[PDB]
Amino acid sequence: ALTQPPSVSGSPGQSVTISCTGTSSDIGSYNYVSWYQQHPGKAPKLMIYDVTQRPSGVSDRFSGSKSGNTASLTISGLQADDEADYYCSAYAGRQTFYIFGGGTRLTV
Amino acid sequence: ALTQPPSVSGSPGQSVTISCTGTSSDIGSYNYVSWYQQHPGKAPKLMIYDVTQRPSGVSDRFSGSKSGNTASLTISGLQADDEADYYCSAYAGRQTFYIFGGGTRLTV
Amino acid sequence: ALTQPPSVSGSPGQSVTISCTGTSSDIGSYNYVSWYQQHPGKAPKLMIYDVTQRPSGVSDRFSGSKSGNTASLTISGLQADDEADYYCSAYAGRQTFYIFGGGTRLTV
Amino acid sequence: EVQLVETGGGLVQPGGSLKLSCRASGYTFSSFAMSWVRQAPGKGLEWVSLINDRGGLTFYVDSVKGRFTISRDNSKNTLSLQMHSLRDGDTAVYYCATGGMSSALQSSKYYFDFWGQGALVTV
Amino acid sequence: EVQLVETGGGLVQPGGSLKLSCRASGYTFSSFAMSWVRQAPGKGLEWVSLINDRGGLTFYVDSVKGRFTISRDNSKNTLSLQMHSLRDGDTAVYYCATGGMSSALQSSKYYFDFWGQGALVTV
Amino acid sequence: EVQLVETGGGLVQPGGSLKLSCRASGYTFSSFAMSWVRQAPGKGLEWVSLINDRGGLTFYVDSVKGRFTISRDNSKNTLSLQMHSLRDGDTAVYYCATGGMSSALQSSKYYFDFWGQGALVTV
Amino acid sequence: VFLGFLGAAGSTMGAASMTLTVQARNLLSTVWGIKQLQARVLAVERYLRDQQLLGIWGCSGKLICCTNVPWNSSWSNRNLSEIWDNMTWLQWDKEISNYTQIIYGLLEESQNQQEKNEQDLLALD
Amino acid sequence: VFLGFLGAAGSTMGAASMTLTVQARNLLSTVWGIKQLQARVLAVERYLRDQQLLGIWGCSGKLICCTNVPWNSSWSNRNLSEIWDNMTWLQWDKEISNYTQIIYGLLEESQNQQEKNEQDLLALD
Amino acid sequence: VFLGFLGAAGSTMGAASMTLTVQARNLLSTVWGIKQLQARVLAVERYLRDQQLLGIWGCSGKLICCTNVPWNSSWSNRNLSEIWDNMTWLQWDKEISNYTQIIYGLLEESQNQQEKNEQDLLALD
Ligand SMILES: *[C@@H]1O[C@H](CO)[C@@H](O)[C@H](O)[C@H]1NC(C)=O
Ligand SMILES: *[C@@H]1O[C@H](CO)[C@@H](O)[C@H](O)[C@H]1NC(C)=O
Ligand SMILES: *[C@@H]1O[C@H](CO)[C@@H](O)[C@H](O)[C@H]1NC(C)=O
Ligand SMILES: *[C@@H]1O[C@H](CO)[C@@H](O)[C@H](O)[C@H]1NC(C)=O
Ligand SMILES: *[C@@H]1O[C@H](CO)[C@@H](O)[C@H](O)[C@H]1NC(C)=O
Ligand SMILES: *[C@@H]1O[C@H](CO)[C@@H](O)[C@H](O)[C@H]1NC(C)=O
Ligand SMILES: *[C@@H]1O[C@H](CO)[C@@H](O)[C@H](O)[C@H]1NC(C)=O
Ligand SMILES: *[C@@H]1O[C@H](CO)[C@@H](O)[C@H](O)[C@H]1NC(C)=O
Ligand SMILES: *[C@@H]1O[C@H](CO)[C@@H](O)[C@H](O)[C@H]1NC(C)=O
After folding, report:
1. Residue whose CA is closest, atom 8 of ligand 2?
2. Counting CB atoms within 10 angstroms of each CB, which of A77, C21, C37, E79 has the fewest?
3. Which residue among G98, G99, G100 is best mutated to probe the pocket of ligand 3, counting the most ligand atoms within 8 A of its Cβ?
4. Residue E77 C-beta-side C-alpha neighbours within 13 Å
5. CB–CB of G39/G118 below 8 Å?
6. What's the number of CA atoms in the CB half-sphere (13 Å) around residue F2?
7. Looking at the CA of I75, which ligand is closest?
């Protein structure tokens, strides 16, 4: 599996950067890293896919990047709705398919 | 390997039920479970094959059954000749072929 | 990997026999055992290949043999130049290719 | 427009057999792969199973390979998960999700774009 | 009618080489697969090796794969087992048995219907 | 006549990327396989990588499979080794060597007949 | 080449399944010249049609080819010993002649194109 | 046999890639007799040439065959949905007609003989 | 197509084993019309016979094909460099011409039907 920070703290208006570092076989071999937002009590939602690609209906405040075997999600202009549990997923191969990281609380 | 009761105790005229519980890959995946009788001092003999099928020359007192990942051999009308060491075998796949269970003494 | 004697001691004019015992999958399965001489400070040199075959330009004093899963290098008529670190290599298969043994000091 | 509705959650005893199901409406069900992802009550997400668009390529996480079975009916727009011999680690809220793989004739879909309400299985 | 007679048992030293053999009479030897099954003196049965009817498909238990070699001569009605580098766990009474697999043109034979007298190997 | 000259050694920090290289003169470079073998300062030799004569069959030791990459240019008579994410166990003097495998149209070459000067990598 | 041709036509199906190369090697070779050319061209076309049928089943270059098509007892409910140790291929062909096209359509399009699409989509992974 | 022939010629490329057997089965069958024999022999030679092209690409007995040849955007820079869900094979053939031989020479000699030599040298190990 | 045809007939066997596609592509194409039709039909039959020989050896769609048949030094006791780096295929064919059928019968029936039966019986497991 992947390692994600347990909690990230941000204040309104500034930026925050969650991270997801992995081994060389999942993130450093495949450019398929997705980020999901799960509000408390509801189901997850796709925020970022393919490292840097964004689904339609999602603001430009959510941005993705990757460096080496590490992936990063940057949320600019934090708002109340941004508070949620954030999980990173990576495609690890055709034997083991999808590895998730532990959640991350964002407190605004 | 499989797990078989160390000893089963029976009295003449009633019935006894030895058991052989296994993992989901040997007994719960293949309907090929055989039971063998080895008298003390001689070589084994086929009693049951294919869970419920009986070789010619063997009385109907020996009966086989399977439920889930567990196989059972039932001997009705116990007699002196029934006293023997009983082993269960299962076909586990084409990589590992045959897994045996530990013996079981029947005392009549 | 393979196991080689840490040091072998010889006197000028007599013979010495370094050994390399391995598992049944490397030396006992493939007749491809090579011996290398690394002088202190320089790079290795091929002394023996294919168990018993000798490269051109190498004296007949260096001789190779194999018995079962064990290979042996015999150096007759020891000289000052013979002092070196000696390593045995075996071809172990197409998954793991080459396994080396620990060095061996020859003191003449 | 896209809505996935899970049904069949319940309380099972260790070693029991359950059959989770997911209904879909709002898109062409036969042109997407579908996945099951579980969230234990106190831990994060974990991918369980994957089935292709046609329904003949099935992939499972190492834990649940021999026990769980994924299947889909592209005429009823239903996805199903048969879980035999449920152990104690299988307690979680299961989400049916759209994505995970794609056909050769479509672009890569190595992500889950649409998720479901959720269905809690306690065992 | 069916009789299998093992020969070649003896006392070997750890690391030695032995050649067990089994003779058969009473049936068509070339239309059955043959297996070797060992019983240690104080433990139960354990399957060692399997050879098909023709003699060109050979299967071994994980322990003895590189060391043991099974072979059969369908003209002499003899089954043989070459055991190199015998370790201490290889002490047991070995039974040659009929069955374990079958040809595509016959029914499944995932069992041992006929066994042999036995041959004790101590090493 | 045969001379292999390694270049590109240096001092790297854990996790860095280096590119070792080996030049050859004295023989037909395109008709031999080439290997990289490392000697740690206080330990013996260890085989790292192998590349065939043509340059399209590449083999690596279990440790360095995903990190190291071997490649060769048969027009420049150069062999190269790209090492990404260098850990602490990768400190050694690396030798480019001739041999390890051969084509179907040549005899077996399961040995290293010609070695290089050496290039020390500290990380 | 001709030696042994059809010599296992009275043997059991299993015994006759060990001489397939003998019958496979014997399938390929004025106004009289055009009649014989038409015979030779029809033999070539017939061999090509058979090989095309093998190739659309994933059975190219194969004299024995297993498939993923279950046997239906409606086609034949006989036991394996009856078929392979107690029947000849001629009797078998007489028995299954009215079921051949069903099997050939279950091999033609279902099994092979399904399997082939799945290999393509697995090669994507 | 003829049923469904060319019926996916106005369908999308993906929809038309599921009926390949229908068009593969329809490729094989006095002075008039020699004219018709010449037509039949040319059909046979044409089928053999196509199968030889498939076989020198490692694509024998295959109606869909993947390769190790990267697609060049110079040949076509269209996206997968455009090609497979928004175009027919006729339009595709019109678009790539002047690039076909480059692809066929990148499949003919580079990919297959390289791969085949590597399998031989791996079988040596 | 014709370019390079037979151009490695004076090259070493190994150098000539890298141009096999050039010679494989060149094997397929009134009273005069029937004579030429007979020539074309014989070329087709000859190609089909060669491909059938390849297919009964497990060598379909393969220009280089390895087998499980050991080489006998009676056939030729020459070393690999002599054959592949110091001989041409014409000289080789001259040397082995009286041993070809033995090799072809060790490939025809022993190796392939044995291997094929074993794959069937392993597919049973
Ligand atoms: C003919 O049948 C007999 C017995 O029915 C059998 O022994 C013999 O091998 C058969 N011969 C052939 C050529 O099938
Ligand atoms: C077998 O054939 C019958 C018709 O005779 C059909 O109803 C049935 O579905 C077939 N079975 C299978 C498994 O396809
Ligand atoms: C197969 O052929 C005939 C002709 O259609 C059919 O009526 C009959 O039932 C079948 N015969 C046998 C022997 O199965
Ligand atoms: C023709 O196109 C229409 C819409 O463009 C589509 O619904 C239909 O399936 C197509 N039919 C064929 C035979 O391609
Ligand atoms: C694509 O084609 C162009 C010419 O149009 C050529 O220069 C280029 O190298 C090709 N790309 C590849 C990857 O072969
Ligand atoms: C392909 O064909 C013509 C003829 O050579 C060429 O000039 C043209 O650029 C190409 N057409 C298209 C539509 O790509
Ligand atoms: C002919 O032989 C010479 C030397 O013997 C060699 O250099 C040359 O490549 C050969 N040419 C061909 C076409 O085989
Ligand atoms: C090689 O051929 C000879 C006859 O020249 C024959 O006796 C021998 O058995 C053959 N060797 C092998 C291994 O088949
Ligand atoms: C091969 O051909 C002839 C004709 O049979 C034979 O006598 C001779 O020994 C062989 N020639 C060579 C050069 O091996």
Report:
1. G72
2. A77
3. G98
4. 11
5. no
6. 12
7. 8
CA dihedral G14, G18, G19, G21 (to 10 degrees): 130
> Which method was it determined by?
cryo-EM
Our count of domains for chain H comes to 1
Give the whole-angstrom CA distance, residue H31 versus residue G31: 10
Tokens of residue A52, six digits: 């840097």
Residues of F12-37 as b/e, b for ≥16 C-beta within 10 angstroms? beeeeebebbbbbeeeebeebbbbbb
Domain residues for the domain of I19 are: 6-122
How far is it, in rounded angstroms, from Cα E39 to Cα E61? 14
Neighbours of D65 (CB within 10 A): 14
G1 assigned to some structural domain: no
Strands A105-107 and A7-9: parallel
Q: Which residues of F touch C91 (CB under 8 A)?
A: 110
The tokens for F33 are 């396989």
Does I122 touch chain E if contact means CB atoms closer than 8 Å?
yes
Q: Of the candidates C100, A81, I65, which has an alpha carbon nearest to the alpha carbon of residue F37? A: C100
Q: Do B25 and D85 touch (CB under 8 A)?
A: no
The reply to whether H22 falls in a domain is yes
Chain centroid to Cα D87, Å, comes to 18
| Nearest alpha carbon, ligand 7 atom 8 | I11
Q: Whose C-alpha lies nearest to ligand 6, atom 14?
A: H95
Residue to test with chain A: of F62, F83, F84, most A Cβ within 10 A: F84
Q: What is the DSSP code (8-state) at residue D116?
A: -
**CATH number, domain containing residue E29:** 2.60.40.10
If residue G115 lies in a helix (H) or strand (E), which one and from where to where? helix G112-123
| DSSP string computed for D35-51 | EEEEE-TTS-EEEEEEE
Please, which contacts does H86-95 make with residues 24 or more away whose CB atoms are closer than 8 Å? H86/H12, H87/H12, H87/H13, H88/H9, H88/H10, H88/H11, H88/H12, H88/H13, H88/H16, H89/H9, H89/H13, H89/H16, H90/H9, H92/H13
Structure tokens at I10: 């004076």
Tokens 């042994």 belong to which residue? Answer: G4
Q: Say if strands E68-73 and B45-48 run parallel, antiparallel, or are unpaired.
A: unpaired
Angstrom distance (rounded) from CA C21 to CA C27: 8
What atom of ligand 1 comes closest to residue G11's alpha carbon?
Answer: 14
Alpha carbon distance D60, D36 (integer Å)? 10
SS3 D4: strand
**Alpha-carbon gap, residue E48 to E45, rounded angstroms:** 10
- Which residue matches tokens 């390769």? H67
Going by C-alpha positions, the residue among H52, G115, H115 that lies closest to residue I60 is: H52
Could you tell me the residue range of the domain that residue D89 belongs to? 3-123
Asked if chain H contacts chain A via 3 or more Cβ pairs within 8 Å, the reply is: no
Which helix (H) or strand (E) element contains residue B48?
strand B45-48
**Sequence-ordered strand ranges (E) for A1-108:** 7-9, 16-21, 33-38, 45-48, 62-67, 70-75, 85-91, 98-100, 105-107
Domain count within chain E = 1
Which residues of chain G from 53 to 92 reach within 8 Å of chain H, CB to CB? 54-56, 58-61
The CB of H74 under 6 Å from ligand 6? The reply is no
Q: Do F103 and H121 meet the contact criterion of CB atoms below 8 Å apart?
A: yes
Token readout for E31 is 């239309």
CA distance H68 to H58: 11
Chain C closest CA to F13's CA: distance in Å?
Answer: 26
DSSP annotation of D53 reads S
Listed in sequence order, the DSSP H helices in F8-95 are none
Q: What is each CA distance from A27 to A38, A72, D61, in whole angstroms? A: 22, 11, 19
Return the number of other C-beta atoms located less than 10 Å from residue C27's C-beta: 26
**Cα-flanking dihedrals φ and ψ of residue F35, to 5°?**
-135, 155
